[PDB]
Amino acid sequence: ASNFTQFVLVDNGGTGDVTVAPSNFANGVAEWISSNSRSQAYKVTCSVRQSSAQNRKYTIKVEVPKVATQTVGGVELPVAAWRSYLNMELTIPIFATNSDCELIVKAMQGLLKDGNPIPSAIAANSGIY
Amino acid sequence: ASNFTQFVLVDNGGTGDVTVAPSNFANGVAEWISSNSRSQAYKVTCSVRQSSAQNRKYTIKVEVPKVATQTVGGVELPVAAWRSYLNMELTIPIFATNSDCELIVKAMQGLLKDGNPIPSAIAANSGIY
Amino acid sequence: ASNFTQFVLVDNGGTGDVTVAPSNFANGVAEWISSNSRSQAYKVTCSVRQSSAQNRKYTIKVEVPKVATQTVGGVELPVAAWRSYLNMELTIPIFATNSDCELIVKAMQGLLKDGNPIPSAIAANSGIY
Amino acid sequence: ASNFTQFVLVDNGGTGDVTVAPSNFANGVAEWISSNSRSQAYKVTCSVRQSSAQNRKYTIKVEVPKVATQTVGGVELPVAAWRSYLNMELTIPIFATNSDCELIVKAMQGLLKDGNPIPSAIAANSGIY
Amino acid sequence: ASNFTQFVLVDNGGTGDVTVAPSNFANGVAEWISSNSRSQAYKVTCSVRQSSAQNRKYTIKVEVPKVATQTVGGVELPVAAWRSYLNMELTIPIFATNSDCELIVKAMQGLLKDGNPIPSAIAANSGIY
Amino acid sequence: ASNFTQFVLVDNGGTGDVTVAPSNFANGVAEWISSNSRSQAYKVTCSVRQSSAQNRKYTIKVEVPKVATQTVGGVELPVAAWRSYLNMELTIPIFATNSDCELIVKAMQGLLKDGNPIPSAIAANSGIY
RNA sequence: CCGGAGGAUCACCACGGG
RNA sequence: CGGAGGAUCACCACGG
RNA sequence: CCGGAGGAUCACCACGGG
Numbered sequence: 001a002s003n004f005t006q007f008v009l010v011d012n013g014g015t016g017d018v019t020v021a022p023s024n025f026a027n028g029v030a031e032w033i034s035s036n037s038r039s040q041a042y043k044v045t046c047s048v049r050q051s052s053a054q055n056r057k058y059t060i061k062v063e064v065p066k067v068a069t070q071t072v073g074g075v076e077l078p079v080a081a082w083r084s085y086l087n088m089e090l091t092i093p094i095f096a097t098n099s100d101c102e103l104i105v106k107a108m109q110g111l112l113k114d115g116n117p118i119p120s121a122i123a124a125n126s127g128i129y
Numbered sequence: 130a131s132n133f134t135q136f137v138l139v140d141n142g143g144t145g146d147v148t149v150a151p152s153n154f155a156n157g158v159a160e161w162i163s164s165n166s167r168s169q170a171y172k173v174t175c176s177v178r179q180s181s182a183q184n185r186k187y188t189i190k191v192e193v194p195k196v197a198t199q200t201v202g203g204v205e206l207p208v209a210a211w212r213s214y215l216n217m218e219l220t221i222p223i224f225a226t227n228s229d230c231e232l233i234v235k236a237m238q239g240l241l242k243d244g245n246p247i248p249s250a251i252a253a254n255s256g257i258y
Numbered sequence: 259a260s261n262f263t264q265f266v267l268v269d270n271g272g273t274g275d276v277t278v279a280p281s282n283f284a285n286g287v288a289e290w291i292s293s294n295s296r297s298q299a300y301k302v303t304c305s306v307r308q309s310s311a312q313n314r315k316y317t318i319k320v321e322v323p324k325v326a327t328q329t330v331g332g333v334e335l336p337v338a339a340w341r342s343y344l345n346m347e348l349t350i351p352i353f354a355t356n357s358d359c360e361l362i363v364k365a366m367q368g369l370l371k372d373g374n375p376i377p378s379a380i381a382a383n384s385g386i387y
Numbered sequence: 388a389s390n391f392t393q394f395v396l397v398d399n400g401g402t403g404d405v406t407v408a409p410s411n412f413a414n415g416v417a418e419w420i421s422s423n424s425r426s427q428a429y430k431v432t433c434s435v436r437q438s439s440a441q442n443r444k445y446t447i448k449v450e451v452p453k454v455a456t457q458t459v460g461g462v463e464l465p466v467a468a469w470r471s472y473l474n475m476e477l478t479i480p481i482f483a484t485n486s487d488c489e490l491i492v493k494a495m496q497g498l499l500k501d502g503n504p505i506p507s508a509i510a511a512n513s514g515i516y
Numbered sequence: 517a518s519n520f521t522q523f524v525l526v527d528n529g530g531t532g533d534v535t536v537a538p539s540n541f542a543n544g545v546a547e548w549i550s551s552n553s554r555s556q557a558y559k560v561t562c563s564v565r566q567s568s569a570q571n572r573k574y575t576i577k578v579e580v581p582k583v584a585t586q587t588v589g590g591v592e593l594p595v596a597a598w599r600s601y602l603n604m605e606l607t608i609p610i611f612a613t614n615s616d617c618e619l620i621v622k623a624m625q626g627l628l629k630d631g632n633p634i635p636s637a638i639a640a641n642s643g644i645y
Numbered sequence: 646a647s648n649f650t651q652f653v654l655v656d657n658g659g660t661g662d663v664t665v666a667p668s669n670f671a672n673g674v675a676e677w678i679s680s681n682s683r684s685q686a687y688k689v690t691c692s693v694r695q696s697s698a699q700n701r702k703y704t705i706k707v708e709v710p711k712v713a714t715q716t717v718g719g720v721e722l723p724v725a726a727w728r729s730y731l732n733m734e735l736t737i738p739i740f741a742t743n744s745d746c747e748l749i750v751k752a753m754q755g756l757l758k759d760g761n762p763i764p765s766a767i768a769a770n771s772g773i774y
Numbered sequence: 775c776c777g778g779a780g781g782a783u784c785a786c787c788a789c790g791g792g
Numbered sequence: 793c794g795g796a797g798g799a800u801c802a803c804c805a806c807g808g
Numbered sequence: 809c810c811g812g813a814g815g816a817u818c819a820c821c822a823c824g825g826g
Contacts, residue, residue: 001253001258003258004246004258008245009240010232010236011238011239012235018239022517022774023772024773025772025773026541026545026772027285030256030257030774037613037614037770038572038770039611041770044240046257047257047282047813048256049813050296051814052815052816058247060247062236064233064236067229068229073713074611075611075714075726077726079569081222082222084219084222084229085218086218086236086237087218087219089215090213091213091215091815091816093213094296095195095211095295095296096211097294098252098294100213101251101253103193104215104251105248105251107138107191108191108248110139110147112234113136113137117132117136117159117161117175118173118189122187123227123233125227126132127159127176128132128133128154128159128177129133160819176819181809190818197332197333198333199331200331201331212817212818216819253293254293254294254295254299256280258263258264258280259521259537260520261504261507261515261516262515265497266497266500267497268490269497269500270493276494282813285802286542288504302505306508306540312469314512316505318498319801321801322491322494324482339482340480340800341800342478342479342483342491343801344477344478344494344495345477345478345802346473346474347473348474349474350509353468353469353555353594353595354469354512354553355512356512356552356553358453361397361451362471362509363506364398365451365473366449366499368396368397368398369396371398374395375391375392375417376433377495379435380445380491381491381492383443383484385434386433387391416796434796438797439799468591513538513549514547515540515542516541516542516546519771520762521762523760523761524755525755526752527751528751546772546773548762562766564766564772575785576756578753578756579784580752598740598783599784600749602736602753603734603784604733605731606730607729607731608729608767609727609728611727614768614769614770615712615713616711617767617768617770619655620729621757622657623731624707624731624757625754625757625758626653626663627689627707629656633652633677633691634689634705637648637693638749638750639743639747640746641746642646643673643692643693644691645675692779696781736784
């Protein structure tokens with residue numbers, strides 16, 4: 001294998017797709033970013049470590065730029081107003097087999113499938129009701 | 130409408146599908162659980178709060194159990210050999226429009242699409258390289 | 259270029275081949291792990307540092323597990339009955355040229371070549387006689 | 388039968404082959420030394436012992452010299468400019484069968500096989516990258 | 517892709533070219549070295565960190581050795597009579613787009629083009645006047 | 646000689662070239678700047694001194710303006726968002742001959758030649774991977 | 775962490791600060 | 793930095 | 809409240825801060 005390759009982060013159906021590509025591997029922490037200024041880029045980082053004796057832990061982070069009214073290549077301040085941050089931590093007991101892990105991934109995909117509660121809420125600036 | 134509905138967490142092609150349903154909303158934390166004993170259930174929780182004056186934070190949690198039957202005191206009980214814990218936090222600026230938020234959702238979906246780096250590494254008990 | 263890639267640790271024909279893949283590279287310590295339950299995985303770690311003014315020191319570690327299923331309370335877990343631990347340290351003065359190093363490597367390969375004293379002894383639960 | 392015999396430590400074609408021969412076996416420590424001036428000789432030592440109730444421990448050592456002529460006062464002596472030192476320890480539980488041990492050996496051979504990460508790094512005065 | 521590749525540091529027209537290759541990435545510091553003994557090697561290191569909340573800093577280092585053969589204790593060893601050290605730090609705002617960064621690279625290349633002031637002064641052991 | 650002359654800092658192939666010209670020589674520190682407001686200019690300074698008994702040290706500094714979305718002749722704040730800073734320090738032992746120094750310059754040109762790792766990384770808002 | 779036309783035997787050191 | 797020092801193995805007690 | 813490629817038996821815990 002060798003999974004450190006570019007991929008489509010935002011699939012807008014061929015036209016308007018956002019692709020992130022390998023941009024750093026310092027300290028075993030893999031990083032991908034879109035072709036933008038670092039302040040307006042889509043960033044993705046991932047790393048895995050043995051957090052405890054019984055667990056392994058994947059730490060995934062994603063940064064998504066606010067696009068509405070954005071000025072490409074411009075200086076947009078304050079930073080906190082123009083960016084969303086996603087921080088995921090996946091803890092997997094050392095007993096998990098590859099199959100177990102496939103299931104875990106399926107569960108994550110299901111959680112965010114289109115039309116499901118969580119994604120629908122987020123996409124509508126809403127909570128649960 | 131009302132987005133607090135049941136959904137398929139683990140899609141196994143209609144056969145062996147794991148479905149979670151609304152089970153609690155006490156204290157502003159929306160909860161879903163699979164049709165199991167509380168000790169062997171899949172669990173999904175979600176809550177959103179206005180973290181800062183200009184940010185909103187979604188806190189999502191998923192628990193994937195490895196079901197087993199343990200014999201305690203000569204008696205068989207339904208338990209979980211272990212659990213995998215997904216803990217994710219998403220911070221979105223209040224200036225994010227609905228289109229801005231859909232972007233975030235699409236990015237998260239892309240991050241975990243089958244074949245992409247992260248899900249591949251996870252499912253193979255490996256890091257990124 | 260990158261030498262932090264996956265490789266065959268055990269060449270059992272072309273079938274039961276044990277392969278280890280990059281898992282983590284934190285704090286100057288590269289680590290490879292075979293697939294499936296981390297609890298039954300093979301582990302290889304390597305690191306190099308300047309031990310002294312004139313010496314560079316490599317520290318390699320290998321773990322060979324004895325795969326087994328542990329049952330307790332009627333609950334089975336994939337585990338390692340026990341593990342064989344290999345800990346080696348190689349010291350090379352900074353005056354060593356690439357050729358000097360190639361030699362050192364050949365010496366290591368020769369020391370463990372099939373049929374030679376040391377490998378033969380180990381493979382037979384024996385010492386020197 | 389005897390495995391305390393001479394062997395080829397360095398396979399440089401079929402010419403500049405470095406061979407080490409039994410020199411001493413005092414106090415459970417077998418020692419091989421290449422021919423000619425002991426001052427410029429290659430050294431290999433090996434010993435095994437019961438490190439604990441369940442573990443047997445092998446301790447192998449190898450010395451690779453950089454041959455050189457030292458001149459002082461107009462007096463030349465065959466010496467070693469410096470030496471590369473390999474010190475390795477292998478721990479094997481007493482439950483290991485001969486097959487288990489053969490595996491351990493294959494793992495060691497694989498770790499140093501030509502082309503693999505660790506050997507490549509060493510042979511090139513490099514670390515992992 | 518992967519930009520961690522070997523390259524020609526000193527172009528001497530194909531004859532007497534100094535080439536450096538990836539040799540280490542431990543601790544987030546990418547290192548390249550020439551095919552020499554560690555004591556006589558050319559060395560290039562590079563690291564990038566997010567210095568401030570809005571800046572990124574590249575730290576590049578180059579070591580140019582004056583190779584020599586020193587006789588220590590009547591023995592000849594490959595050493596460096598002395599070394600020239602280049603230490604450069606580049607701070608780029610996160611708002612810099614790719615085009616903005618190409619500008620920086622072009623400026624640095626221009627700064628050192630043959631015939632220009634700075635390189636002329638340096639190569640002549642003189643200041644600017 | 647007399648190297649304190651104007652030169653092309655950014656070569657964009659005849660059209661769109663950035664030229665910096667002598668603008669100050671206070672304290673032996675030579676300075677060049679482009680035809681812009683000091684806040685948006687390309688600035689270059691260079692000075693050389695005997696840093697220690699065995700070394701001479703050239704200190705070169707370069708400031709490059711962020712051009713994307715720039716408003717020519719306008720007031721752009723904060724300054725740190727619109728400028729990149731390069732600080733180079735070259736230490737050369739007093740034994741270095743002119744030839745030695747020519748080599749040092751070649752090494753610097755090589756380090757930044759188009760297509761090489763460092764320039765490629767910088768130009769792509771990336772690290773090494 | 776930040777600064778110096780601060781030093782180095784060069785991924786280190788001292789100083790100065792908040 | 794040392795040990796044919798121990799380990800459940802990037803840890804541990806001792807000696808400097 | 810905020811931060812950590814901090815930990816968890818997982819809506820909890822410790823630490824670090826203002």
